[PDB]
Ligand SMILES: NS(=O)(=O)c1c(F)c(F)c(N2CCCCC2)c(F)c1F
């Protein structure tokens with residue numbers, strides 16, 4: 002692929018093939034809490050996911066994804082800034098090379114060790130993910146900052162699955178899993194209009210960033226980093242990091258629900 006996270010093909014370089022990299026609505030961002038606007042029009046976030054929609058886990062080379070069946074509204078996000086319900090299609094993580102960075106969003110400059118993204122597409126307005134992905138109101142992503150500390154037992158099925166998808170392109174069934182079990186117990190959030198955080202970088206995402214972090218151990222983060230970006234048979238190339246730097250707000254307002 003034309004892009005990665007390496008020195009040559011990584012975030013610093015994306016704008017060459019994806020000029021939107023320098024756009025006005027790029028993600029992730031640093032959330033400065035003294036510049037947020039508390040907003041009473043927001044509703045609470047409501048997730049209702051059906052574990053029967055979990056489908057597959059797959060190694061996509063720069064990361065791994067857990068995908069869900071998205072042919073109907075069995076698993077949905079509602080509330081917050083939204084009037085439409087958004088259909089779950091995937092979750093995945095971002096991490097860094099050491100515990101000291103790795104999240105995509107930061108809060109008052111503080112970097113967390115990893116970030117969970119639970120991604121959804123607007124099935125009220127669009128008929129598929131590929132249609133929704135380029136639309137300003139097409140995607141809703143919950144970002145959960147992950148703070149290195151106590152092992153998180155809720156990650157267990159995900160981590161136990163990685164041994165079946167060690168190298169790029171490997172897929173496996175991943176069933177009977179409700180990813181709302183990964184969310185923090187408080188769903189207070191910030192929201193802002195932004196983008197996908199890697200190519201094609203479309204400015205189609207309403208971000209929902211949880212105020213409360215969830216934990217992850219140093220050894221759990223190691224399991225992410227020991228996934229391999231090469232295909233089976235080649236020299237092992239671990240996936241050490243896949244977070245993008247924070248981008249300029251360019252005048253957007255981050256709103257707080259709390
Ligand atoms: N890290 S993220 O949550 O911002 C994110 C995402 F959720 C996506 F679905 C995609 N897409 C989905 C639409 C087409 C393929 C890639 C993407 F690029 C991406 F960066």
Ligand SMILES: [Zn+2]
Nearest residue numbers: 094095118198
């Ligand atoms: Zn992501």
